[PDB]
Nucleic acid binder design. Sequence first.
DNA 1: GATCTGGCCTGTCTTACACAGTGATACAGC
DNA 2: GCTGTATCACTGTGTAAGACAGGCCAGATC
Lengths: 346, 541
Amino acid sequence: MSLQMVTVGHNIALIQPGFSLMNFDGQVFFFGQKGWPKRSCPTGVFHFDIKQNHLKLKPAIFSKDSCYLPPLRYPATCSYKGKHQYIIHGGKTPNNELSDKIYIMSVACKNNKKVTFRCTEKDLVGDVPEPRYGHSIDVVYSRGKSMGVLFGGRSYMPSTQRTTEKWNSVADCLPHVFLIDFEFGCATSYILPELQDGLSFHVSIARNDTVYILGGHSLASNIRPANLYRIRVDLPLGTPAVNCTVLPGGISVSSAILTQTNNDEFVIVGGYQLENQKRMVCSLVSLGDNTIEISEMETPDWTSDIKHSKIWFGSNMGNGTIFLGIPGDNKQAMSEAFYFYTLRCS
Amino acid sequence: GLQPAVCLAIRVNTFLSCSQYHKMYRTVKAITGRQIFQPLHALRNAEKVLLPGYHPFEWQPPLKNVSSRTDVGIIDGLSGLASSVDEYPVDTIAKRFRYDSALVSALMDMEEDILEGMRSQDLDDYLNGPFTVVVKESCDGMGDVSEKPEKAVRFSFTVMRITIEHGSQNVKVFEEPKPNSELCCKPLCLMLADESDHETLTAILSPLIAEREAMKSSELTLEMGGIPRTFKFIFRGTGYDEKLVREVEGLEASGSVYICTLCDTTRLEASQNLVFHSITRSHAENLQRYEVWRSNPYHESVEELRDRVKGVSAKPFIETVPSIDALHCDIGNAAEFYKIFQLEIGEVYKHPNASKEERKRWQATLDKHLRKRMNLKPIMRMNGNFARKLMTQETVDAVCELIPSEERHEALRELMDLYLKMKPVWRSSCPAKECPESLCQYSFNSQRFAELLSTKFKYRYEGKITNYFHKTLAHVPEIIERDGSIGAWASEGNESGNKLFRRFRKMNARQSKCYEMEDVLKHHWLYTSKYLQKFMNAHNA
DNA sequence: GATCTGGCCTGTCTTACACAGTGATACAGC
DNA sequence: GCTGTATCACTGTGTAAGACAGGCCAGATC
Ligand SMILES: [Ca+2]
Ligand SMILES: [Ca+2]
Ligand SMILES: [Zn+2]
């Protein structure tokens, strides 16, 4: 319950809602700038550090071998901590295409705290999904082995119903589950019976053999249900197997923000209860080996603009630290583009 | 009594209200007994013929990804983009037609003109040949349009040349008399957004690009004067300033080391090799070169990668023709030699590294002196009137009388007559016939300018040079060989249309910020028809 | 303790951005 | 003498972002 107001560097303009914050080695990096990459910072990914509530988005460079990647605007990221690296997939490019590539994002070198990145375009082979955004992907383990489980968000209309008065219309993707191996990048889809509706902007937790999915919006029904889903996954040497279970007692919040404040104990912060009612409360989800549950924290205090703005956005910095953004009222003394806040929960 | 069409051309073409016209009508009808102006609802039913969305038409083949209906009106510009609190925030309002349904009314309003062209060019009026229609597209941000800022972009097109392939050759069935004027570029979409807010700009302009790529391999059959006729199209998007071609074709920003949107050169190299280039930047080469940026197949570092990809860093999404603007070229040249007048007041070839106070004095004495000689108005942003007025021999001979030394007199007079010798062959709308001899002398006419810059002006033009001067020297004898005309392929109409937006905005609106962008589009469509402009030459015909 | 580079800041240089439109008057035909 | 155009003298500032080059400087390095 520790709110703190932040000031900005010289270029606030590289912010946009739906960014991506990557935590490598305590260092924080920013990816998903507004617009195409400028000439002063050609990779469009930044050493994002903050000293005394003042942040310095310094540019980060790439390796000899990397493949420069476009700034996605709602991708799916996960933490392959097996060296330490991240996996980026999906999102929405600046030209509002939907990508469907795999981006392996790792540290190439770091000399005198000057980082050097390497990302590689891992391509998907086999039962690929459609390109989509608002989806989520977790890494998972079983029996000395590991996989990537991907649950869908929303996407465009298919290539036959694309009429140019609904050319930017969107629908929920199919409730499938996509199992991905990254040793060859092979993709296997799976139809699963307990999942019926398309879901978007949801929360995915990977407790090391089982992924729990809470929240998210169903667009085709235009509600945000309070259903969480526990998915058990296991791979033998032959064909792997999945399982779904419905555990009652969830919360009806779309696009919340997650971080890990304790081991086997995660924490979600304020999103959207309804289309007019944002989620003001904030929760500590106490996980478990088999049984998990969700409790409230002691309601962190906000300020006037946060209790006054219609929207917010942000992500986590990785080390128990939430970054939030606010539009700010335009009918004022030429007010700034966005205001910024940090939440700390100790 | 009157037609509904003549009084429609009245109420549009002199900007009366929805209610002042009722006053004029009721006073005329009360005084002179007989009604002379048609009433309101009888005017409104006569609007619907001239709007898009009235006539049957079909395509061969039926168009991929396009709805096949013929009864579309004004459609919402978001193309059904969801604007929900859960996803990305948008706040722009945009309105548009489709692209086929606009071209239908654009061809059917000039029906009498193409029929009379068929008469005057000695052909069958009962002909149904495969016409080719050349359409020029234009787009510009026209921002700071508020009232007691906010920006706005119109994307617009122009029917320019209708040509049949009769027998063994082609004939110009219809040609536009004044290409780059404000009343013959028709509004197609308009939005309230920044011209560099790249997300929302792409999100609105991508449907029209989809429809444009759709109708590049089909035919339109349309009942044109009794019998049906068939049209195929050729699009050239040309109406772009340097910023928009530099942006949406996906180059670096305008201050790049790589300058030309047509060839590939650097300013530390362009200042020595002046005229040996060509056009070496397509749209497809640009797209695949973005792809070879994104893959990095050789694994080289960033500074020589950008050497190899020649400064592409983005995915282009609008096919343009690589071609100069005519207006902004002249404005850039004008402001350049105005600044070189300001510099040559100081005579800084004698003493370099002058102070940043005496330059303001050089500006002040330039403005006061040229207000004394030729009465130029002291302004900052060079408009079109200032651009036309600065490039006279009288002003350069006046400041020649101001400057002390003798070699600067020849150095400025000879340069001014060389530049004015170069000017109209791009300034003209058909310079292939209007001044067709200096058009052939242009090579010597340009390289003399180049050599006297590199020799007698090498104090400044040994290192950096600016952008538009490279375009003037390097390209336009090849642009006349490719496309022919120059000034017809400009955005002067689109650049002039912006005042009409403001006048329509504060004289015809319903104050809802959603119908407000309907009715300005409807009125701007009703303006630029040639069916109504034919009535406003009745006192000339 | 010398001696280095990249970090930041100026600091110029490039493209865009509002002049068109109104009463009065004056000439050219008619 | 009448009318239809053609001038005519008025009006309004310096921004807004963004690329590229040196100058400096300041802690890192040998
Ligand atoms: Ca422009
Ligand atoms: Ca303009
Ligand atoms: Zn060139």
